């Protein structure tokens, strides 16, 4: 019925999680971007299959470049200096299917090498993880989605636990 922020709630191993989806706002990001300060982690999603898809429909903008630009803008905000990012590279089946039909070299002028999933994934990831510059305070966790099993929830739970532990140690001053 209502538009705007959508909230989903679930409990995993006695931890209560809250997730806010802000994709329906369609307004200036800066005005509402200072309201979300204080979150524990930021979940970020990227599709590998957009390398050879002109999703944007603009010749100048390729979906991968747009995703990289958005990730760069989000990661280096003044407010989110100390919030970690859980990066989810998604759709690894179709991407692996199309690599041999059209290699990864279309997106980047530099060669990925070998035209196969392991090498291609490494090049796309390294290129996404190098966008950050506050390496001292924030870190990125990367998981390739697995549909059948529950690796998706467990990875988020473990990442949140690690973030909480590292936050407490830093406050004590030990870390």
């Amino acid at each position: 019925k209502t538009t705007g922020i959508v909230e989903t709630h679930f409990t995993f191993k006695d931890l209560y999680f809250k997730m806010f989806d802000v994709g329906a706002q369609r307004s200036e990001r800066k005005k509402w971007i200072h309201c979300f300060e204080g979150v524990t982690a930021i979940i970020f999603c990227v599709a590998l299959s957009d390398y050879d898809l002109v999703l944007a429909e603009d010749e100048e903008m390729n979906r991968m470049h747009a995703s990289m630009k958005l990730f760069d803008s989000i990661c280096n905000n003044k407010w989110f200096t100390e919030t970690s990012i859980i990066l989810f590279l998604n759709k690894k089946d179709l991407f692996e299917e199309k690599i041999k039909r059209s290699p990864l070299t279309i997106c980047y002028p530099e060669y990925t090498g070998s035209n196969t999933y392991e090498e291609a994934a490494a090049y796309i990831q390294c290129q996404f993880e190098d966008l950050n510059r506050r390496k001292d305070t924030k870190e990125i966790y990367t998981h390739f989605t697995c549909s059948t099993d529950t690796k998706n929830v467990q990875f988020v739970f473990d990442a949140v636990t690690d973030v909480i532990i590292k936050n407490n140690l830093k406050e004590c001053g030990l870390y």
Binding site: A122, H143, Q154, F157, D158, T161
Partner: peptide
């Protein structure tokens, strides 16, 4: 058990 995939 939560570590980033090796770069």
């Amino acid at each position: 058990f939560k570590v980033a995939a090796r770069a």
